[PDB]
Design a protein around this ligand. Structure first.
Ligand code: CL
Ligand code: CL
Ligand code: CL
Lengths: 1135, 321
């Protein structure tokens, strides 16, 4: 019944879900190249607007209420059809006429994701109605309608068609959400008679101030294609028409929801079709409206101009996406489409570069101005043209001999198209698509994002623009604090930290530093070997001044949930430097200079020493910085929780760094004098305890070690918070740093070996406690997917051990059968309501206080039910409510003494009933999102990438084909779980669209901009055998399946680096993709070969599938020298 | 359509299954119907009525209040045709809130709330428990939800129960439902499904009771009552009428009661007076004052005066004089 097919609709290819109304309605984002947003259900219910929720065309509510609003909000169509001497009413897409007709409902979405079609076939009448939503930068939203008579009858049809619950301009989303009824009283909907255009405005902007408040803009809707339409500007007569009566034209309705309906009478002949469109736009002033009214009256080609602007939208969307290697053509369009949408959702969230490596002088100059006024005054940019390259900027910078300009020039990222991922399914996130200037609609080069989200997106983005990697690394490092953390958000201007408003506090996320930095360091060392070495002694890095005071070690040990204070005095000094310098005012100074500068080695030590200072042997990295790691739903693990996850990634980080140091020929390092004691105390602690690694570490020695590491970090930060950096550095041995890295790895490796479970899975998060104030004890938590992802990413296990983990995982309680993928942690039965809160009779009778409270029928703490069972008071949420109630009791004379005597006993009974010591967060206590029985897809896709990396290791090290085969089988199965080949009913949406999660009781939830997409981009490149090493690009698939290759000839339409829309003809036994926006064709052949085609009309061939460094730089550098690459692949190497 | 009262009837007439959904807009102009609305003279009861003129079937439901039991929805299905009908009915209430959701959160973030919902049936009694898995809070701390909203029923024989609206549409399309006793992540509902033969010129009645802010002890008391109290229907009806009587006593103390030739005027005077005393208050008991209340009032007003004045000479109850 519910199938999914490829179907041409008026010459454009769409995916079609047949019988979409047999599915539970699901939520979609319709994407634009411009500033449109549209969040729509498969039932038609929607919100839409431009820029943000404050310019909504339809009201901005949560996705449940959007879905529930389809009958009264958005699209509405009623047809009065004369057949025989009977007037027959048909209302497609409604639930107003249940089972009155045999109907088929179909849903279509195009391959680019920017058009959607709703279709209803009335099988009894042989009539089909379709409407399609499109976007136009110029005109707004365009609803294209088609009524098709495929019967053998002629029908006299009176139709009422349009859109309802149109917002007026200038209602805040908050007011519409909370007080929609009051808003109605200010609505005035009008028709401009000559044009038929509808004006949807307020009589006044609603405001608390006793002042005039004129509403001088409006939302609009207008129409083309119908002869002599009558118009409604409200839904008042809709029901009259529904009941088979005729309507009266409306041109001035006050106090009612806006609507725009067209009414016409037509004779629809057999085997014919009638078409029309409605256009709607937001934020229109008097001038805007007059321009449209004039166009309607005088511009004969206005329909064509609208259609042209729609297609321009598609073309621009393709150009944006194609620049990040979105375009692939294989035998499987589902895979090709998913890659397209993955890439789009990546660049929507993290941004896309404006134009290859090109920079505009004006934007760049303004950026320098905001960053550092001293630098801006001093640097003369005349030698640079109006437009220049990243290379031109590097060369210019190299001549200015100014380290602050070097940093700002390097940090510059000409990104556009990014926006925050808020929507009706993520209503806690505010979104705004700020991609067109409010002044003239020109492009906006800006970005902002949460730390983890944006640095994740950028890892995938860097693949398509490799020469920006240095920029990203410096942005990251230079926005990190001296004590080894970072602010919560980055921007083009710089960075933002959270502030305090309560039970409100700030902090640092434990996962933010190591793994996200590492993926960039790995990238640059593959693309530009030696480049990191060149920064070892280069004092061009800075420290972000985030005004957070991490408390002394003894205070953290005492209460590890109370560990970071906001330093308001430090904040004032920053704000003062910001007025005096610009953004650079948020960098640490030294005693000597305005801005303190350090080298790459010092920046790495800053972050490594901070983590190692929280290293609990055999337990992981202590979570004690008032924020969680990746999983917000286990946020109560902050305090006594310890991350093995971060330790696994730290293993990978330190091995990488160990090799980096080993490949260096520098004999010394140079670091802040202040850091010397810290570095040395940590190194020494590890060196003098290395003898302990021969066995297991006692709880006593665990504390000896942590105390020394923690005290060293605390003395360092106290000194910097109070005295600052004095400005002097000291020369130390490179050998000493290699010794530090080696011993750190010995300790981490020992800790990893202590964290294997009997089932072969690894611990993700552990608990620590301080005992006899002399010991640190470890205890364990449930199996967690995130632990398996991290240990499989660690580089520590052998291929056989990796495969044992994955075999354990497949056989564990994390495998969810119906979706054949992985939970974050086991599903568990929570106690039913009447099983939650019973006190044993024995416990009550043994307590004098509880027994007395029962005797006296006091119900403030305990109550006895009418079958003689005992319960804690129903208002208690946790122990703190119980305590408060016991203090209230202690005010009464007859309870005072007993309360003092037995308070601890009663509290212990409470803890016995509720087991709140085991609480790790809302993860274990709800049923959506990260909750019980829910698949959180980002983590599954992180597993997929880790497994891929495990497959590449086994192939590289020439493991047995049995081990390689079993690891690949895991890879292919995990990929299947991701669900691109599932039926729409099982997936719960279009399987080519990413969603954040799939809960136990529904299909896919939260469409679009999940971080999942960046992982799947990287995995796809790995599958295609795109490897970079030693500065050389290799195109050599080992994991790619034979069935990816075309079975018939197809045309690959792609975009060049210079924005030329071109085509290549593919034959059978080939496929195509792009890399750095060069088209690459794989073809099955008798012999391996690569052929590089250059824009000089020449080509060059070799048997080796590894390109040389210069050719590879020509690819990475996007200079248009290489036109395309063809790679001849052995059938026997395909899977 | 999605919140509150919902009723669907599958009626065997000829060898055809006919679906009728009174008060809905789901079957526009399928039947000739008459809808009537009733409100009592005191304003504390309301009846919704739909006559299906094609079938000679009338459905009514009435909302009443009970201090003891909460809200009481009294249902009547009346066959005034000359036919005998085999009817499978699904009747109840939907989008029942769980206990402990703030009005602010329900207004702004209803979708998040769903992920915390758990609706259960107490099998022996047929009582529905509408709760959260945890009270929703920003703090990283445990947050137990130890109260619930409830609904239960009297008057239908061997009913099947739903605790969600998941299968409502299946029934609407003429299919039979599966019993539910534990639904997670969905809007609460309470539906009864029974099959009955409704003879010509006969009427069937039932009631649904719903209440808020119920703890474990409150729920056990209702489950015990359902199992052991033979006169529970009468006790509910008694408490409803006590409510009317108390309403009249309050209002009458402020001269609400008039009887003229025109009941519209008499009724308007009643409601005027009620809305006046609802907003400004009514005196407790003529000019009578309680020592305890008065003493507490003086204590809060002026501690010096409270310390100085000895109220012993006044009785437990005394007049303004
Ligand atoms: Cl936000
Ligand atoms: Cl973000
Ligand atoms: Cl310096």
């Amino acid at each position: 019944s519910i199938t999914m097919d490829m179907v041409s609709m008026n010459g454009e290819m769409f995916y079609k879900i047949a019988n979409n109304d047999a599915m539970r309605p699901f939520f979609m984002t319709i994407v634009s190249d411009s500033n449109h947003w549209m969040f729509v259900s498969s039932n038609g219910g929607l919100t839409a607007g431009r820029k943000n929720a404050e310019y909504a065309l339809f009201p901005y509510y949560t996705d449940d209420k959007i879905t529930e609003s389809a009958d009264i909000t958005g699209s509405k169509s009623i047809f009065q059809i004369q057949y025989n001497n009977e007037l027959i009413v048909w209302e497609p897409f409604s639930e107003r006429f249940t089972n009155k007709f045999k109907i088929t409902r179909n849903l279509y979405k195009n391959y680019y994701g920017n058009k959607i079609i709703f279709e209803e076939i009335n099988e009894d009448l042989g009539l089909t109605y379709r409407y399609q939503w499109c976007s136009s930068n110029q005109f707004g939203f365009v609803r294209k309608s088609e009524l098709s008579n495929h019967s053998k009858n002629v029908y006299e049809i009176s139709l009422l068609d349009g859109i309802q619950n149109i917002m007026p301009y200038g209602v805040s989303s908050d007011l519409q959400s909370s007080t929609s009824n009051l808003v109605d009283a200010y609505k005035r909907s009008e028709l401009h008679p000559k044009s038929g255009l509808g004006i949807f405005a307020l009589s006044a902007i609603i405001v608390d101030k006793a002042e005039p408040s004129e509403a001088l803009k409006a939302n609009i809707a207008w129409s083309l294609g119908l002869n002599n339409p009558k118009y409604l500007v409200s839904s008042l007569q809709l029901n009259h028409f529904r009941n088979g009566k005729s309507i009266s034209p409306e041109d001035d309705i006050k106090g009612e929801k806006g609507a725009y309906f067209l009414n016409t009478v037509m004779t629809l002949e057999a085997n014919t079709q009638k078409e029309w469109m409605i256009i709607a736009n937001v934020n229109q002033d008097h001038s805007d409206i007059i321009a449209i009214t004039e166009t309607i009256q005088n511009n004969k080609k206005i329909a064509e101009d609208i259609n042209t602007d729609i297609e321009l939208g598609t073309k621009r969307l393709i150009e944006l996406n194609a620049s990040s290697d979105a375009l692939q053509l294989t035998a499987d369009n589902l895979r090709d489409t998913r890659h397209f949408s993955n890439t789009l959702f990546n660049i929507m969230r993290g941004g896309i570069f404006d134009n290859n490596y090109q920079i505009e002088k004006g934007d760049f100059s303004n950026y320098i101005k905001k960053a550092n006024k001293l630098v801006f005054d001093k640097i003369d940019l005349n030698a640079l043209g109006e437009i220049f390259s990243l290379n031109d900027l590097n060369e210019f910078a190299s001549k200015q001999k100014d380290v602050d300009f070097d940093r700002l020039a390097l940090e510059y990222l000409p990104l556009k198209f990014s926006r925050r991922h808020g929507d009706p399914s993520r209503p806690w996130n505010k979104f705004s698509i700020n991609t067109q200037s409010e002044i003239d609609g020109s492009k906006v080069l800006d970005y902002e994002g949460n730390w983890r989200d944006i640095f994740q997106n950028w890892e995938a983005l860097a693949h398509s623009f490799p020469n920006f990697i240095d920029s990203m690394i410096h942005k990251f490092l230079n926005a990190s604090t001296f004590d080894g953390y970072n602010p919560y958000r980055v921007t083009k201007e710089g960075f933002d930290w959270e502030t305090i408003e309560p039970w409100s506090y700030i902090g640092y996320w434990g996962d933010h530093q190591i793994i996200y930095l590492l993926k960039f360091l790995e990238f640059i060392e593959k693309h530009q070997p030696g480049k990191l070495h060149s920064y070892f002694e280069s004092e061009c890095f800075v420290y972000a001044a985030v005004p957070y005071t991490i408390k002394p070690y003894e205070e953290i040990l005492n209460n590890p949930k109370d560990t970071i204070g906001y330093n308001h005095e430090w904040e004032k000094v920053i704000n003062e430097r910001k007025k005096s310098i610009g953004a650079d005012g948020a960098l640490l100074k030294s005693n000597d200079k305005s801005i303190y500068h350090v080298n790459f080695i010092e920046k790495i030590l800053a972050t490594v020493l901070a983590k190692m200072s929280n290293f609990i042997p055999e337990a992981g990295i202590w979570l004690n910085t008032q924020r969680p790691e990746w999983n917000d739903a286990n946020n109560a693990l902050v305090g006594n929780g310890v991350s093995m996850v971060t330790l696994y990634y730290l293993r990978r980080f330190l091995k990488f760094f160990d090799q980096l140091l080993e490949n260096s020929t520098l004999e010394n390092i140079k670091i802040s004098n202040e850091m010397v004691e810290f570095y040395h105390k940590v190194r020494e602690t590890l060196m003098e305890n290395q003898h302990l690694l021969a066995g297991s570490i006692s709880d006593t020695d665990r504390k000896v070690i942590l105390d020394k590491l923690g005290n060293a970090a605390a003395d360092y930060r106290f000194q910097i918070y109070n005295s600052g950096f004095w400005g002097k550095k000291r020369t130390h041995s490179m050998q000493g740093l290699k010794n530090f890295t080696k011993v750190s790895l010995q300790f981490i490796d020992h800790s990893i070996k202590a964290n294997q479970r009997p089932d072969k899975l690894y611990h993700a998060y552990n608990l620590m406690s301080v005992e006899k104030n002399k010991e640190i004890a470890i205890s364990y938590l449930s199996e967690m997917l995130e632990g398996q992802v991290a240990v499989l990413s660690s580089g520590f296990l052998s291929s056989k051990e990796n495969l044992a983990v994955l075999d354990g995982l497949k056989n564990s309680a994390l495998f969810r059968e119906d979706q054949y993928s992985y939970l974050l942690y086991p599903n568990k039965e929570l106690p039913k309501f009447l099983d939650k809160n019973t006190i044993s009779k024995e416990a009550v009778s043994k307590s004098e206080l509880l027994s007395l409270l029962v005797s006296k029928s006091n119900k403030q703490v305990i109550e006895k039910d009418s079958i003689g069972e005992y319960h804690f008071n129903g208002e208690f949420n946790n122990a703190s409510n119980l305590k408060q109630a016991l203090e209230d009791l202690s005010q009464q004379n007859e309870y005072k003494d007993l309360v003092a005597k037995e308070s601890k006993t009663v509290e212990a009974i409470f803890e016995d009933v509720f087991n709140h010591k085991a609480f790790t967060g809302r993860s274990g206590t709800f049923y959506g999102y990260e909750g019980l029985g829910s698949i959180y897809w980002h983590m599954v896709s992180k597993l997929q990438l880790a497994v891929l990396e495990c497959c590449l290791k086994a192939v590289e090290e020439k493991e047995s084909e049995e081990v390689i085969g079993r690891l690949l089988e895991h890879y292919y199965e995990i990929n299947e779980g991701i669900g691109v080949h599932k039926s729409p009913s099982l997936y719960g949406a279009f399987p080519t669209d990413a969603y954040s999660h799939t809960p136990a009781g529904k299909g896919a939830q939260q469409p679009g901009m999940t971080g999942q997409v960046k992982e799947d981009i990287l995995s796809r490149f790995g599958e295609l055998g795109i490897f970079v090493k030693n500065g050389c690009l290799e195109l050599n698939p080992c994991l790619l399946r034979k069935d990816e290759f075309l079975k018939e000839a197809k045309t690959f339409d792609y975009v060049t680096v210079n924005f030329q829309h071109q085509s290549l003809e593919l034959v059978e036994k080939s496929l195509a993709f792009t890399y750095c926006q060069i088209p690459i064709i794989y073809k099955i052949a008798n012999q391996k070969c690569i052929e590089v085609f250059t824009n000089d009309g020449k080509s060059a061939k070799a048997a080796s599938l590894i390109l040389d460094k210069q050719t590879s730089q020509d690819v990475f550098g996007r200079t248009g020298i290489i036109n395309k690459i063809e790679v001849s692949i052995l059938e026997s190497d395909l899977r």
